[PDB]
Amino acid sequence: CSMCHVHPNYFSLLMGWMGITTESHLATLASSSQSPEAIKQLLDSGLPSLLVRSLASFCFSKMPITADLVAPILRFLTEVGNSHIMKDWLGGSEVNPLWTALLFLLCHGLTTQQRTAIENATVAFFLQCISCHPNNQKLMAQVLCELFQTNISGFIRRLFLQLMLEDEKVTMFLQSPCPLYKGRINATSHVIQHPMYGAGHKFRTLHLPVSTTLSDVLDRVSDTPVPVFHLFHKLLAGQPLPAEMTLAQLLTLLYDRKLPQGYRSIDLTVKLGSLLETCPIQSPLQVFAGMGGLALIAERLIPAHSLAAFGLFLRLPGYAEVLLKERKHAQCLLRLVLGVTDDGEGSHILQSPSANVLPTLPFHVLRSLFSTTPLTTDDGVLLRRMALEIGALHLILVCLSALSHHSPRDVEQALTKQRLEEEHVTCLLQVLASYINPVNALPSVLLELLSQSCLIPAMSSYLRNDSVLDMARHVPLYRALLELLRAIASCAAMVPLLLPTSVGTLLAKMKTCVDTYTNRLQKTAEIVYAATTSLRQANQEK
Amino acid sequence: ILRVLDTSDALKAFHDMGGVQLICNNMVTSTRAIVNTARSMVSTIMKFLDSGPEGIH
Amino acid sequence: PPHQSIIIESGARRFVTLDFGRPILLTDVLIPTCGDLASLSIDIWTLGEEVDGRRLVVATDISTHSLILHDLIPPPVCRFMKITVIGRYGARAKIPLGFYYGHTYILPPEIDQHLAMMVALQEDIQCRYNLACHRLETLLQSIDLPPLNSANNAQYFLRKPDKAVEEDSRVFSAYQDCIQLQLQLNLAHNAVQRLKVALGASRKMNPEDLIQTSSTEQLRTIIRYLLDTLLSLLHASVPAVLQSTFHAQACEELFKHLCISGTPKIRLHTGLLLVQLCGGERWWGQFLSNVLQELYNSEQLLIFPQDRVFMLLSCIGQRSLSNSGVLESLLNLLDNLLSPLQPEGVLDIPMISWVVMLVSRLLDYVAT
Amino acid sequence: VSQALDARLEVGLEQQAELMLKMMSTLEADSILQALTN
Amino acid sequence: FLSDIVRVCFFEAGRSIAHKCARFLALCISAFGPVLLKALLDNMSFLPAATTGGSVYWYFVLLNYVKDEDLAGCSTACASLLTAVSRQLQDRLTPMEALLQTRYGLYSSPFDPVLFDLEMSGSSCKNVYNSSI
Amino acid sequence: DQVSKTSIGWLRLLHHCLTHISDLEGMMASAAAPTANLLQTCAALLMSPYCGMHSPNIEVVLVKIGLQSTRIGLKLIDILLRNCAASGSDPTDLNSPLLFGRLNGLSSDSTIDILYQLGTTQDPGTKDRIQALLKWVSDSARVAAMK
């Protein structure tokens, strides 16, 4: 490859020797054709047509192709797809059928080993093509959606789990005027890369996830960490890169610095001696969900109730935008509901550090969606219609009945169960409050489904007790209850659920009791109670 | 000895007296008369056989 | 897979009763050795202690021989399993409750609805299998293995660096996950095949294109059983046609094919068979010299567990030391390897180390 | 091994040859072990 | 037609049926010895194309018991089959398997979908799942 | 001590002489190269387990000595690539150096760094060094046609 890079005509001599103008021939051609200027000469003779026509003909079931030969040629396309010039062409018009063709092969003499090799090669090829090229993301999303439209199992689920639902790794090439000793061993180790990366103690190549930061890179490349290390780039000349910047921000900055998209590696100079608010770039899952493909997945489909609630909530339009704010939690929930126990990166979702937030997360994100979706526009009314059609309220009421033991008309383990049940009840009440008040909107089934349900009996049971210290500790629970009552009072059309023991009378009774206690001698709870008392008094006469 | 040769004048005088050839000759001769006492393949293979013929026992 | 312990409560005669919660067609019972015992009795009963109470087997030598019951024919449907243990009367003791295997779904739910709710599970576990395979590939394709031809590599092997230990652990975890899930997928496919046969569908129906289409694990199992039968037949004996079949260019290829890359069991058994058959031949010994000169040569690029085959060679040589040709051939090899310093080749130190330690082992053994 | 045979007298028994199977298995195992010891 | 009997009994069938057929042969043991040895020797060439790994244990036990009938032809055919199979197995090696069994010593290549047998303290378990108690 | 047990103290003295003051450095190099078997001894000390001084210092010494001329550079290339034993060494003397006991052409990160430093330093004689490297590559390719 280096020899061909020095002498362009040697590449033509190589191709003539090849006979174009087996596995060994193909691999040698792939490796030797990596020069920035020899690649265009390779592409102009026999590169596209033969391979694309052959693979298309094989898919439909033109040089003859056997089952065994399919994998090596696709591996060749994988290996040559490193330069940006090649990667752009892979998204061209004539290559568009290819992807769909492969799906037709993998969605239905192909032995087990042959099928496994073909599917692994196709997954690798698609992952490489979609690595860091935003332009190809739209094409891939369109292909996936048109396959979906015209439950899920088989190779398609595997592709969804691999290409999506996981973070992306990128290659960084670090060079410094001083040697880098960390990460090396005294034993022999044959590591071979492209000659452009060089050899010695002054160069390093790291294939690492984009979620890391610059401090992680410095720790992984140098053991030394005002003597510090500054990472420079040619495009951002003279500007030291803060260590707190993430790789996503790096990619966004370089891409807005007219760097060719999908370029093979990011170059940094590690010298020895306004950008913190840069927005990260969009993940492939974000691009796919931008067009609304997650709802199709939801409709096309270990606490069973929580998973069922999450799956039902996924059907609502606009759920994806709110849910994908936290990539890790969203992907963990999607993998868990997809029937996979672990993310495949070496950890179990049950063992994830965010395990305490997962059980209540669907309710919190649904409440956020309710608060962030105004009812003035048609989006609100369509969301209400869809929610009533799919019976999300029915499931919420069933869960409330099961948890509160109010049928519609180990000691330590018991304590843990009651505490988590209280938290679940608080979350459900907050969700209902946000549903009723976002800050012909009244369904016909509403003002009737709430009646005879567990809502009124549950509120009556919770507010019936009127001591001053036994239940004064449940500040967040009563804050949520009073917020729900305020939301009830906000909507006039459903107020008569309160008007005819009495909510207002005994509520004012505890208000007077706490006022007398204050006069004779938790502030947030009492002031919220006073505000709810005032609002209930105002809505009581109206 | 390193502390003695800490200055330019000392190093120049040491070079003039021909010490730099002396140390190289000494290194070459002394490497011939020493056997490495570190462990090697033989110890590894004896360990692989699981047994054989302040850290003390 | 299950995992159980006894937290019930050994100076008292004891009994235990277990309920499966459902009539389960038990077809395999195994128990480990129970040293602190004198007798053990078995009771099988589904609904009553006298309506259908039965006993399977009673044995008194469980402490000496662990009770292994491979299969029950005909298989009796059961739900209540009682084991009465009679310890030796002459502190607390733990007695593992063995292993039990059987079938849960009974056919003449009841309808052939399983074909709809097994195939989905088979496809799901197959997808997980593909995921595990890809994960193992992408994890273990970025590792190396230093050759043992220098002091640096030797000290690397003596004391593993900190960076390699975590990679070893992660690869081990991925490997065990992959093999377990492979087992699950194979079991699901087997169950689907059984159900397909039950409805009346028939099972699947020249050596060339038959040998090269078989499964590798089947090949390993059949070779193991076949060679074990050969060894037993030879021990029960003096074959002569068998001696005619095995000769030069036939033993070398067999040793290279099986002992190099086989399992430890087949490696050891093949070595013993070779030493028993061609122990007293004239060409023997030179064969060992050539094998050592080829495998452990500094020009070899093949990868294999050098230590294990070295121990196998040592063990074979100890048994074959009688013919006096093996030691002569080894000494000739050692003499040849040391030629350069006598009077433009150089010294192959690692090869010399290998051969000299082998000769030292042999000379120690012959000293008695 | 272990001389533990399931209750087969009640039904038409094959135990008279199942025991022979057990003895043959034990004999083969002992022959293999003595081959290994040589 | 003992040859076809063995062919349909120990091959192209399940585990319990093979166990019952071995039971029947053992009962029929007590002139039959050499005849059954010839039949099993003829059927040995067809052994590699069997179906279940648990269906050969009783078969090989029977061959081990009846090997006393003759020692010449059986050994010759057995060695021929061993020689024929040995080469084929080697050709299926891949670098990953060798690396795994050298650096870590982990055999039984986990990249093959097909398995053939299982074991637990001398018991053959196949075509049946484990009881989850 | 490791200094008392091995021959590494002289190497530390040489490293100090070469690298303590950069002004006199060239002079010292001119006095060190003409000694016999020095490069072979330094290379042998480089590819051994840590015995008292780290690899980078040995690399620095080897690079600094091997660049003061052009014949020395070719000798160092031959030492690193094709033959690393002593020069004019007959085992019949019992007093001449004999650096057997190490295979030829072993690659380690230190060797790669030294080769990279030698190859890509712009000075007179660099053309000869590139010629020697390409000649070694050509010889290795040619010897592969042994059948």
From Swiss-Prot, chain A:
Q: Where in the cell is it found?
A: Golgi apparatus, trans-Golgi network membrane; Endosome; Cytoplasm, Cytoskeleton, Spindle pole; Cytoplasm, Cytoskeleton, Microtubule organizing center, Centrosome
Instruction: Write out the tissue specificity statement of the associated record.
Output: Expressed in brain cancer cells.
Task: Cite the post-translational modification comment.
Answer: Ubiquitinated; mediated by RNF41 E3 ligase and leads to proteasomal degradation, impairing inhibition of apoptosis. Deubiquitinated by USP8/UBPY. Autoubiquitinated; mediated by E1 ubiquitin activating enzyme UBA6.
Look up the domain of life of the source: Eukaryota
Question: What's the domain remark here?
Answer: The BIR domain is essential for its anti-apoptotic function and is important for binding to DIABLO/SMAC and caspases.
For this chain, the family text in UniProt reads: Belongs to the BIRC6 family.
What do we know about how this protein assembles, alone or with others? Homodimer; antiparallel. Interacts with RNF41. Interacts with DIABLO/SMAC, likely with higher affinity to SMAC dimer than SMAC monomer; this interaction blocks the substrate-binding site and inhibits the caspase inhibition activity of BIRC6. Interacts with KIF23/MKLP1, USP8/UBPY, BIRC5/survivin, MAP2K1/MEK1, RAB8A/RAB8, RAB11A/RAB11, PLK1, EXOC3/SEC6 and EXOC4/SEC8.
What does the UniProt function comment say about this protein? Anti-apoptotic protein known as inhibitor of apoptosis (IAP) which can regulate cell death by controlling caspases and by acting as an E3 ubiquitin-protein ligase. Unlike most IAPs, does not contain a RING domain and it is not a RING-type E3 ligase. Instead acts as a dual E2/E3 enzyme that combines ubiquitin conjugating (E2) and ubiquitin ligase (E3) activities in a single polypeptide. Ubiquitination is mediated by a non-canonical E1 ubiquitin activating enzyme UBA6.
Q: In its UniProt entry, what is this protein called? A: Dual E2 ubiquitin-conjugating enzyme/E3 ubiquitin-protein ligase BIRC6
Record the organism: Homo sapiens (Human)
The gene for this chain is BIRC6
Swiss-Prot record, chain B:
> As annotated in Swiss-Prot or TrEMBL, what is the tissue specificity of this protein?
Expressed in brain cancer cells.
Q: How does it assemble?
A: Homodimer; antiparallel. Interacts with RNF41. Interacts with DIABLO/SMAC, likely with higher affinity to SMAC dimer than SMAC monomer; this interaction blocks the substrate-binding site and inhibits the caspase inhibition activity of BIRC6. Interacts with KIF23/MKLP1, USP8/UBPY, BIRC5/survivin, MAP2K1/MEK1, RAB8A/RAB8, RAB11A/RAB11, PLK1, EXOC3/SEC6 and EXOC4/SEC8.
Q: What is this protein called?
A: Dual E2 ubiquitin-conjugating enzyme/E3 ubiquitin-protein ligase BIRC6
Q: Which organism is it from?
A: Homo sapiens
The record's similarity note reads: Belongs to the BIRC6 family.
Question: How are the domains described in the entry?
Answer: The BIR domain is essential for its anti-apoptotic function and is important for binding to DIABLO/SMAC and caspases.
Source superkingdom = Eukaryota
Q: Where in the cell is it found?
A: Golgi apparatus, trans-Golgi network membrane; Endosome; Cytoplasm, Cytoskeleton, Spindle pole; Cytoplasm, Cytoskeleton, Microtubule organizing center, Centrosome
| Residues included from the entire protein | 3085 to 3161 of 4857
Its gene? Answer: BIRC6
Q: Write out the PTM section of this UniProt entry.
A: Ubiquitinated; mediated by RNF41 E3 ligase and leads to proteasomal degradation, impairing inhibition of apoptosis. Deubiquitinated by USP8/UBPY. Autoubiquitinated; mediated by E1 ubiquitin activating enzyme UBA6. Proteolytically cleaved. Acts as substrate for CASP3, CASP6, CASP7, CASP9 and HTRA2.
Q: Sum up the protein's function in the record's words.
A: Anti-apoptotic protein known as inhibitor of apoptosis (IAP) which can regulate cell death by controlling caspases and by acting as an E3 ubiquitin-protein ligase. Unlike most IAPs, does not contain a RING domain and it is not a RING-type E3 ligase. Instead acts as a dual E2/E3 enzyme that combines ubiquitin conjugating (E2) and ubiquitin ligase (E3) activities in a single polypeptide. Ubiquitination is mediated by a non-canonical E1 ubiquitin activating enzyme UBA6.
